[PDB]
Structure 1
């Protein structure tokens, strides 16, 4: 179990470094992953990025409309067309708040699994939204910085 960092921490705002090749397959990486799944499961989250626990690595985990349990390294996202869709987001680093955010409806995402094998998936809707949100942590973007409709940004208890 690790502490989740909160919005305002400078560590959330950095561009994350890639997982280096010598870590792929390794026990050190596996332990980071186990620590991340424990943390996410302990607070009831659907996704967690390594910078949210102060680890400066392009590594996200997610899973749950169901979403397959995935561990994604060094990701690259390619929007499949121009269609945008609005949805509710929250984040463990932004407790007590929700906002509506416009995201690509369809994306292809690519990256590596923990053993260094390629991932290549094309996805839509909520799965697409989750991946965009997690991958935004890796470039120092939290979901308030993506909001366009501020009428829909508020406290959970109130909205």
Structure 2
């Protein structure tokens, strides 16, 4: 089902989310969470979603797009469950994007993040990954790990001048 998405202002979105145990992923309620999470992220037309965004401080991130209406330009993104992630910048080069967040509705903000990172996670399966992601993917992944350390894009806005509502930014 679709869970209620917490909005910027709730202190939860700022608390640090702790790791998931190899025990949990094989748990029943966990599987029911990934279900909800996906169901919620889709109804929201978002590129991804972090557990805390719905009240759960577990290091659980979800993603997936395929022709998105909320961010027209962007490339389709393949669904994937990202757990206990750990990103690291592989360069100082940065790609700029007017990011948005389901937890900060109706607004957009230019944010410059590194464009090439090394990330290491784990899946519903228990598999260990450790690749180097680049381009839009990296952006989204970074954006969503942030939620896990209580960080929202507004905290990184290149500059408050470049931040506002949609209805007005496109005009």
> Structure 1: which 5+ residue stretches go unaligned?
none
Quick check: 1:45 aligned with 2:46? yes
> Whole-Å Cα distance in 2 between the matches of residues 74 and 114 of structure 1?
11
The answer for the alignment partner of 1:107 in structure 2 is 117
Match of 1:116 among 126, 147, 161: 126
Deviations 1:29-75 (A, max 9, x none): 21110010011111211110000000110000012223221110000
Quick check: 1:95 aligned with 2:105? yes
- Relative to the length of structure 2, the TM-score reads 0.89
> Whole-Å Cα distance in 2 between the matches of residues 22 and 123 of structure 1?
28
> Structure 2: which 5+ residue stretches go unaligned?
66-74
Q: Secondary structure at the match of 1:28?
A: helix
The answer for the alignment partner of 2:70 in structure 1 is none
Aligned pairs for 1:8-47 within 5 A: 8-47=9-48
Quote how far apart the aligned CAs of 1:93 are: 0.5
- Relative to the length of structure 1, the TM-score reads 0.96
Contact map agreement 1:86 1:103 (CA 8 A) in 2: yes
Q: Secondary structure at the match of 1:45?
A: coil
The answer for the alignment partner of 1:5 in structure 2 is 6
Q: Secondary structure at the match of 2:7?
A: coil
Contact map agreement 1:109 1:121 (CA 8 A) in 2: yes
Q: Secondary structure at the match of 1:85?
A: strand
The answer for the alignment partner of 1:152 in structure 2 is 162
Match of 1:129 among 139, 142, 155: 139
Contact map agreement 1:47 1:130 (CA 8 A) in 2: yes
> Whole-Å Cα distance in 2 between the matches of residues 119 and 72 of structure 1?
10
Match of 1:86 among 96, 101, 110: 96
Measured on the aligned residues, the alpha-carbon RMSD in Å equals 1.1
Quote how far apart the aligned CAs of 1:101 are: 0.2
> Whole-Å Cα distance in 2 between the matches of residues 6 and 95 of structure 1?
8
